[PDB]
Design a binder for this molecule. Sequence first.
Ligand SMILES: *[C@@H]1O[C@H](CO)[C@@H](O)[C@H](O)[C@H]1NC(C)=O
Ligand SMILES: *[C@@H]1O[C@H](CO)[C@@H](O)[C@H](O)[C@H]1NC(C)=O
Ligand SMILES: *[C@@H]1O[C@H](CO)[C@@H](O)[C@H](O)[C@H]1NC(C)=O
Ligand SMILES: *[C@@H]1O[C@H](CO)[C@@H](O)[C@H](O)[C@H]1NC(C)=O
Ligand SMILES: *[C@@H]1O[C@H](CO)[C@@H](O)[C@H](O)[C@H]1NC(C)=O
Ligand SMILES: *[C@@H]1O[C@H](CO)[C@@H](O)[C@H](O)[C@H]1NC(C)=O
Ligand SMILES: *[C@@H]1O[C@H](CO)[C@@H](O)[C@H](O)[C@H]1NC(C)=O
Ligand SMILES: *[C@@H]1O[C@H](CO)[C@@H](O)[C@H](O)[C@H]1NC(C)=O
Ligand SMILES: *[C@@H]1O[C@H](CO)[C@@H](O)[C@H](O)[C@H]1NC(C)=O
Ligand SMILES: *[C@@H]1O[C@H](CO)[C@@H](O)[C@H](O)[C@H]1NC(C)=O
Ligand SMILES: *[C@@H]1O[C@H](CO)[C@@H](O)[C@H](O)[C@H]1NC(C)=O
Lengths: 386, 177, 135, 135
Amino acid sequence: GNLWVTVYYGVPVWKEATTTLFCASDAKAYDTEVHNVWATHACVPTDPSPQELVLENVTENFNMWKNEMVNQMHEDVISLWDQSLKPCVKLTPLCVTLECLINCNTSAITQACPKVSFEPIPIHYCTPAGYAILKCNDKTFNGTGPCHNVSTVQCTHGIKPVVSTQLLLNGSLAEGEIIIRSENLTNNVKTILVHLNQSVEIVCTRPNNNTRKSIRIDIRQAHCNISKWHETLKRVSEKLAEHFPNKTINFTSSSGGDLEITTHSFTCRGEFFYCNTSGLFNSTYMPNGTYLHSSITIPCRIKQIINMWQEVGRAMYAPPIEGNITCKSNITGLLLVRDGGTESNNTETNNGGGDMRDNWRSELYKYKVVEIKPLGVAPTACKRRV
Amino acid sequence: KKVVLGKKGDTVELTCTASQKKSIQFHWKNSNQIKILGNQGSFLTKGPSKLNDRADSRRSLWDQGNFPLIIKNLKIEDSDTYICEVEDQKEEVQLLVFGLTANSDTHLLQGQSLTLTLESPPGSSPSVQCRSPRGKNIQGGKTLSVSQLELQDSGTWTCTVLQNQKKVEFKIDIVVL
Amino acid sequence: GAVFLGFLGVAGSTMGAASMTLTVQARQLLSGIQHLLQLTVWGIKQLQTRVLAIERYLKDQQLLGIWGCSGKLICCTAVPWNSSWSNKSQKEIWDNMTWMQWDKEISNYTNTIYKLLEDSQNQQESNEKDLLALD
Amino acid sequence: GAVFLGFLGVAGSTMGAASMTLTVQARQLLSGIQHLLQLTVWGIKQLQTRVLAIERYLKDQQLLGIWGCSGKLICCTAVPWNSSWSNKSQKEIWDNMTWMQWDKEISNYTNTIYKLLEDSQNQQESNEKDLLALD
Ligand SMILES: *[C@@H]1O[C@H](CO)[C@@H](O)[C@H](O)[C@H]1NC(C)=O
Ligand SMILES: *[C@@H]1O[C@H](CO)[C@@H](O)[C@H](O)[C@H]1NC(C)=O
Ligand SMILES: *[C@@H]1O[C@H](CO)[C@@H](O)[C@H](O)[C@H]1NC(C)=O
Ligand SMILES: *[C@@H]1O[C@H](CO)[C@@H](O)[C@H](O)[C@H]1NC(C)=O
Ligand SMILES: *[C@@H]1O[C@H](CO)[C@@H](O)[C@H](O)[C@H]1NC(C)=O
Ligand SMILES: *[C@@H]1O[C@H](CO)[C@@H](O)[C@H](O)[C@H]1NC(C)=O
Ligand SMILES: *[C@@H]1O[C@H](CO)[C@@H](O)[C@H](O)[C@H]1NC(C)=O
Ligand SMILES: *[C@@H]1O[C@H](CO)[C@@H](O)[C@H](O)[C@H]1NC(C)=O
Ligand SMILES: *[C@@H]1O[C@H](CO)[C@@H](O)[C@H](O)[C@H]1NC(C)=O
Ligand SMILES: *[C@@H]1O[C@H](CO)[C@@H](O)[C@H](O)[C@H]1NC(C)=O
Ligand SMILES: *[C@@H]1O[C@H](CO)[C@@H](O)[C@H](O)[C@H]1NC(C)=O
């Protein structure tokens, strides 16, 4: 016959929004470790009732680059880092519009800079009311793909606060296997990301061993006796080939520049360990790798005058501690883009990452924040008296 | 990878493919994914960028599945990778636009000298192969100069610059008196 | 539904599932038959949420008012449907498009329906007076 | 309206203004699309207010119950007006006597109206039974 409308309440329909979310973060509120200091001051001890009420046959495109929840975590972290980390003398730049003399005059900013500590907190993200944080048990997606056997949460899972480049420390791991994240193969900047389904050992020790500080008118010299690993890189290459089929697989070019994009740059003693492109960056893949063959060696050392991943401009940290440091880790994956172009003939090379908005997005492809739209419309044969 | 080039005063074209040929949702977004130009159904979301005043697209073509993107009056800052994400892939153009000029403005004399300036955008390793009405193949990098400038050098100079597999022609106008 | 609210179904469960978990939420909550010196602030932040829950809860649970079914959990409106809007029948409807991917199909009529609904509410007011114009 | 409540109009704006800002309060909140060691106590005192807001909110937003329109924001009663009470028509009514200076004109019928209103509610109950006495 004819068709008429109904509308009703509460019928889980969670269209998009990406608003503020609150943390769930069990600090100690006692340890001087600034991680927990922030995790309690501006963050809150944990939520004990998360209910992953698993989805049925959803089809939702957990597009991992339209999730401003990730930007929100980003800005939360940038908020964390600065009362966390104390730059002695920050030389940040500025100009005020004057068409070409835009007054880019170096703004020096002095402060006080002692040490505290560094130890991540798996924080979690918590939708506001009427909002639901869709998760994803599938992780593949090609980058953009749903998940059958996941659903909502109340607060999220642990997403820690350490930052590093192409390779993390003390951080997440990968759930099922190694998958990748990108799109079109015409020009290919489109940074690719892998989550590596095993762990790896990275450990740097330096008790004193170098009492003599300078060389001329070494303590900053750090030797990272690590491991050996390689087979995870074989899984690396086999994946790469599964997406780069007919070509071999190199890296072949770490051009350089600002140290933080190329070198393994990771946070320990508040500072980082900066070496060249000599290590583990080399092998080619036609059906074999190209390297060789406990804590043996790899030479990544510390600097002091760093750049910020946060806002452009330098920073000037403190002289280090006498020695006896160590940091372990559990690599979740890696950060890579083809060193591509059009000069190339049938060898293929991947090459590097320094944008956090993905550095903490190999952990949030699942999380899609939504409101509720619990008012719903549908057809019936419902109409009133005349 | 597929580059384009400009001339600091020209326009340029950037391409987006689509197999349904149907005007489906595309968005044009630069390196770190600001929104620049986007098909929202049957509409174009002039994104919040440096290019809220310039960029555009041939609009008719969409119902064909070919979505373009132009950058009118290129200045060296519009030089950046872009991206088009029509359905499941993210085609990236890469635009490295520059321009060039000479030192002399209105007044020259015979036996004097003139120099060059090419306003490249960062990250470029070009090579300036430059010409003359007299066949002065000034072979070198950026700053091209010659110690001999004569009345016979009158007439503009076809200057060119190779930035990663392409060039684009140039005036170097020469007038006496 | 991940929170004090959204309590009439589970995500991924398609419509019919949530629609019926309505009544069992009812029937399940019907009968009822370390603490740190700065746990203060967590309790505090814990507070808002619950209030805001009720607040929003009402805030449109209220403005189901002009929609003629405030307070409750289940409307049935009185409007003629536009097959141009979804053109689907309860069978696939309730069993498919696990709502989150359901309403996006109609992400635009979001306010046209509020339009027609408050419109029919005013329609009822008009007929009430027409009917009362004699007795 | 200076507070979380009184949210259906602005002072000095006469009646019609507030009456219509009802629906736009609805439509405006529909889509949604230093900290000192003793800031504790301010948050604390900040708390009450919001609760009490909901509390009073309901507390008679509730007892619009016996008034037959609890929960909602807009009644229409069913009583015969006493021109002895205000003797004014919507035109000047809604456009003048910016309410604060409106109700003082009837500062006494304050409870006579509650009288007649709950009275007509009981009137409805009586007619419901009269009508049900056969089927
Ligand atoms: C290129 O790859 C295909 C598989 O995708 C393979 O069958 C083919 O043999 C390869 N080319 C050559 C020359 O082997
Ligand atoms: C819905 O259908 C009615 C008639 O069936 C028509 O008058 C009205 O314009 C339609 N509305 C929309 C939004 O399609
Ligand atoms: C729309 O509904 C009509 C009802 O007769 C049906 O015949 C038609 O196939 C439907 N079309 C779509 C696209 O749902
Ligand atoms: C829901 O969709 C699936 C696949 O599209 C189909 O097999 C199933 O029959 C649908 N449900 C109904 C009630 O038709
Ligand atoms: C969705 O598919 C699953 C597959 O096991 C099935 O159990 C379920 O019944 C389907 N959804 C609905 C609403 O029936
Ligand atoms: C339906 O909603 C979508 C949501 O983006 C919108 O793009 C589209 O234009 C709407 N339909 C029409 C006919 O405009
Ligand atoms: C109050 O007077 C002002 C004039 O300043 C006028 O604009 C406004 O309309 C008046 N208030 C109302 C509710 O009309
Ligand atoms: C109110 O009006 C009714 C009839 O309209 C009348 O019987 C009653 O006496 C009036 N009371 C007052 C106080 O005006
Ligand atoms: C009272 O109401 C009567 C009804 O016709 C009207 O004529 C009269 O002007 C009113 N007086 C006042 C003071 O409101
Ligand atoms: C309200 O009173 C003022 C002055 O007495 C008058 O100008 C205005 O027209 C009145 N409102 C109405 C609706 O008549
Ligand atoms: C109406 O209220 C006023 C308030 O001051 C009161 O003085 C007056 O007695 C009341 N009306 C009657 C008729 O009593």
